[PDB]
């Protein structure tokens, strides 16, 4: 893309790629948080 | 939820454009499956 | 006569599934527990 | 010299259950202990494949090359030398001659001049094509040359190349797995739609041997492949054969544990379409313009503004010939769908000699003095002679001609000047005299006047495009409606899909649409007859698969969801967005449940503990 | 919009509409997960 | 950093002993990335990391 297309247009597609990666790792972080919460509940039960 | 027909009805022209987004529907489907099975799991453990 | 909310939300890509256990069986379980106790 | 024979026998297409043949490496990538998925043109498994027998007897028929040929040849003694491909295999077009020589092949895409049969007195008596022509692309290289040889060749012509994925595999068909490799890539890049296999026949009249061959084709299919510790393919799985295969493809595995799984969705896939539209009322008169007993004068042509009707250009090409619609900005057939405020139609009469004078940027007596046309005019013109009517016998001194003016004129205006023209240095004072002239003269038509001076009524249908709803656009048609069926509809511009039934709702006289709480259409008032109908789109649902462990058995049971299977597609060829695996109903114990209904399992009056939950107080198990 | 104008910018409109609707779907899904987790906790307490 | 026939990459190069077939050009891994290349001047199979 850099060797065939100008940065005047690269930034749009790389920007959509960024935001796609950001919602990817963002829902990733969200599900990680949910799993961490449920794991913490399980650990508390085990401690009791 | 039926993701494709939700997003753009039956317009076959749109379905061509949805391929360029990667796997973006299976995660939603599997999350819904998980919550659905969890409901029945909860009822069974609480009553049986 | 009119369309129910079930079919209404159906015809836009949303479906509602039925549960596994039924009210008769639930009542049977409750009655069994009460008789036992 | 090209020879004749009368030895042939035929056979309807014999079939075998093509087990596991038709696989090839799709790329040049190396993988190990990795499972991959692909999707391209492929030969389906367990498909009916034709058997052709050639053995006096002689068989060189012409056969199609729709996509590609899966060629399996159990042959010996080299009864075949080479082959040919092309588009028509006749003289006029280009064709390919890929003849595998005794130690070579020759290729050439070019013009030929064919007989029906090639041979030599092995072809240098080059009666493949009985006359020599030029050729372009040629290639010479090293020779690429109980049944024990299995010549498997796949012919592919895409991306402007000749993908001969050639595998000289040394061997009905053996129940096993064997892939195949590419061998040559040549960029020819022509159509090539038909081919004929060519053979090598040697004499003992003439003599031929015994051989057998088969024909296959490829379709776009999704496939699953398996690789061992090395880069050798071991097994493959089709993803469109059976629900078990679909489950394997979805789960991305070769073994499936006991359970219930979801594969895909289902809809009705509607048929045909309906275009209900209202009636047509308002018409405007063209007979008054095209049939006036006394036409408008050359100077006082009438500019008529058109609206408050319909534009029935359908009846506008229904006139006898001679219609000079050298029109601008629109096609005639298209005309009926355009809309304008003011169609300033102009009507005058001009002698037929100079019909071409009135046009954008045209010269002539009336074109530079009487009527000069805009260079940006968009509209059509209809002309016709009125030699029979517009000229009267006893001397037509009633009608009049005009021939002169002072200067040039702007586009689109009416000129009725009849005044004296000042010609020379002497003044005129408005009367004929010293360098003075009065232009007007009459027809004085007797039936004798010639073709050029015979009338040709030219009507300039000036569709001046401006901004109005323009009642006068064009007539609209309609069809008949069919009820209780999956139908695409368009109600006066409101498009959609569904089924239509009766109702009891009471609309107000001035309501057309109807919306529910969910903000969507539910009822429509049909225009032609003022009734009320209820719109219900076509049903749909999901698909679930019930199966025991793979290590146990192979039978499966299939469930539909939320559909009354009084309505399940009994199917003709395809009315089911489930991938068309309908099963016979009576013997398979079709049973209506509250979760759709099931096909493939029977019901008993016994009762046991639950093994596989299906739903709504039902279970299933593999027993007995 | 499919029958008014040219594909090159009709496709722009289609792209933007797709983006908006997919974002809304994501939001709804996340809300559902949160509510499901809370209901699960209540169910455990009731069972105990 | 290298560029084999337009294929860019970076890492330590070493001899790799996977039984490449003649029609096989280069190697890929499970994560869908380049792993092994052949020199189009001496024709030797190599490893990348």
From Swiss-Prot, chains A, E:
Changing residue 3 to A: In strain: Alpha/B.1.1.7. It comes from the Viruses. Changing residue 2 to F: In strain: Omicron/BA.1. Subunit of the fusion protein that is processed upon entry into the host cell. Mediates fusion of the virion and cellular membranes by functioning as a class I viral fusion protein. Contains a viral fusion peptide that is unmasked after S2 cleavage. This cleavage can occur at the cell membrane by host TMPRSS2 or during endocytosis by host CSTL. In either case, this triggers an extensive and irreversible conformational change that leads to fusion of the viral envelope with the cellular cytoplasmic membrane, releasing viral genomic RNA into the host cell cytoplasm. This is Spike protein S2'. The gene is S. The chain holds residues 980 to 1027 of 1273 of the full protein.
């Amino acid at each position: 893309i850099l060797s065939r297309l100008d940065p005047p247009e690269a930034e749009v597609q790389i920007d959509r790629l960024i935001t796609g990666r950001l919602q990817s790792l963002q829902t990733y972080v969200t599900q990680q948080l949910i799993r961490a919460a449920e794991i913490r509940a399980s650990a508390n039960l085990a401690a009791t | 939820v039926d993701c494709t027909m939700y997003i753009c009805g039956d317009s076959t022209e749109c379905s061509n454009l949805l391929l360029q987004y990667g796997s973006f529907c299976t995660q939603l489907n599997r999350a819904l499956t998980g919550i659905a099975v969890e409901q029945d799991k909860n009822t069974q453990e609480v009553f049986a | 006569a009119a369309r129910d909310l079930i079919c209404a939300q159906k015809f836009n890509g949303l479906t509602v599934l039925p549960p596994l256990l039924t009210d008769e069986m639930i009542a049977q379980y409750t009655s069994a527990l009460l008789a036992g106790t | 010299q090209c020879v004749n024979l009368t030895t042939r026998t035929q056979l309807p297409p014999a079939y075998t259950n093509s087990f596991t043949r038709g696989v090839y490496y799709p790329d040049k990538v190396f993988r190990s202990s990795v499972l991959h998925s692909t999707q391209d043109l492929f030969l389906p498994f367990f498909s009916n494949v034709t058997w052709f027998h050639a053995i006096k007897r002689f068989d060189n028929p012409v056969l199609p090359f729709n996509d590609g040929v899966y060629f399996a040849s159990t042959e010996k003694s080299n009864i075949i030398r080479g082959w040919i491909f092309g588009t028509t295999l006749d003289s006029k077009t280009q064709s390919l001659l890929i003849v595998n020589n005794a130690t070579n092949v020759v290729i050439k895409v070019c013009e030929f001049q064919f007989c029906n049969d090639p041979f030599l007195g092995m072809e240098s008596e080059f009666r493949v094509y009985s006359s020599a022509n030029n050729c372009t692309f040629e290639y010479v290289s090293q020779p690429f040359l109980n049944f024990k040889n299995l010549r498997e060749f796949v012919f592919k012509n895409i991306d402007g190349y000749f993908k001969i994925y050639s595998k000289h595999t040394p061997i009905d068909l053996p129940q096993g797995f064997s892939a195949l490799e590419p061998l040559v890539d040549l960029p020819i890049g022509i159509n090539i739609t038909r081919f004929q296999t060519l053979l090598a026949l040697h004499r003992s009249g003439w003599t031929a041997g015994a051989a057998a061959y088969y024909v296959g084709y490829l379709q776009p299919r999704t496939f699953l492949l398996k690789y061992n510790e090395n880069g050798t393919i071991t097994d493959a799985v089709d993803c469109a054969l059976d629900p078990l295969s679909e489950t394997k493809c979805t789960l991305k595995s070769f073994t499936v544990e006991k359970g219930i799984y979801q594969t895909s969705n289902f809809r009705v896939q509607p048929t045909e379409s309906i275009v209900r539209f209202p009636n047509i009322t308002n018409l405007c008169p063209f007979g008054e313009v095209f049939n006036a007993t006394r036409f408008a004068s050359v100077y006082a042509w009438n500019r008529k503004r058109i609206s408050n009707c319909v534009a029935d250009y359908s009846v506008l090409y229904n006139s006898a010939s001679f219609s000079t619609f050298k029109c601008y900005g629109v096609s005639p057939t298209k005309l009926n769908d355009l809309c304008f405020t003011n169609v300033y139609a102009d009507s005058f009469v001009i002698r037929g000699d100079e019909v071409r004078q009135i046009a954008p940027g045209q010269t002539g007596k009336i074109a530079d003095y009487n009527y000069k046309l805009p260079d940006d005019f968009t509209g059509c013109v209809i002309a016709w002679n009125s030699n029979n009517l517009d000229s009267k016998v006893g001397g037509n001194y009633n009608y009049l001609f005009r021939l002169f003016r002072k200067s040039n004129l702007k586009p689109f205006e009416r000129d009725i000047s009849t005044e004296i023209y000042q010609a020379g240095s002497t003044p005129c004072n408005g009367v004929e005299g010293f360098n003075c002239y009065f232009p007007l003269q009459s027809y004085g038509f007797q039936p004798t006047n010639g073709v050029g001076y015979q009338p040709y009524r030219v009507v300039v249908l000036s569709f001046e495009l401006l901004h109005a709803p323009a009642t006068v656009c064009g007539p609209k048609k309609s069809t008949n409606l069919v009820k209780n069926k999956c139908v695409n509809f368009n109600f006066n511009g409101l498009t959609g899909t569904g089924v239509l039934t009766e109702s009891n709702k009471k609309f107000l006289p001035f309501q057309q649409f109807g919306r529910d709480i969910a903000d969507t259409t539910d009822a429509v008032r049909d225009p032609q007859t003022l009734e009320i109908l209820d719109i219900t789109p076509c049903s749909f649902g999901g698909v679930s698969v019930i199966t025991p462990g793979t290590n146990t058995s192979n039978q499966v049971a299939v469930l539909y969801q939320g559909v009354n299977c009084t309505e399940v597609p009994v199917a003709i060829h395809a009315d089911q967005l489930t991938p068309t695996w309908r099963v016979y109903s009576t013997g398979s114990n079709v049973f209506q449940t509250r979760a759709g209904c099931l096909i493939g399992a029977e019901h008993v009056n016994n009762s046991y503990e639950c093994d596989i939950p299906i739903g709504a107080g039902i279970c299933a198990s593999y027993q007995t």
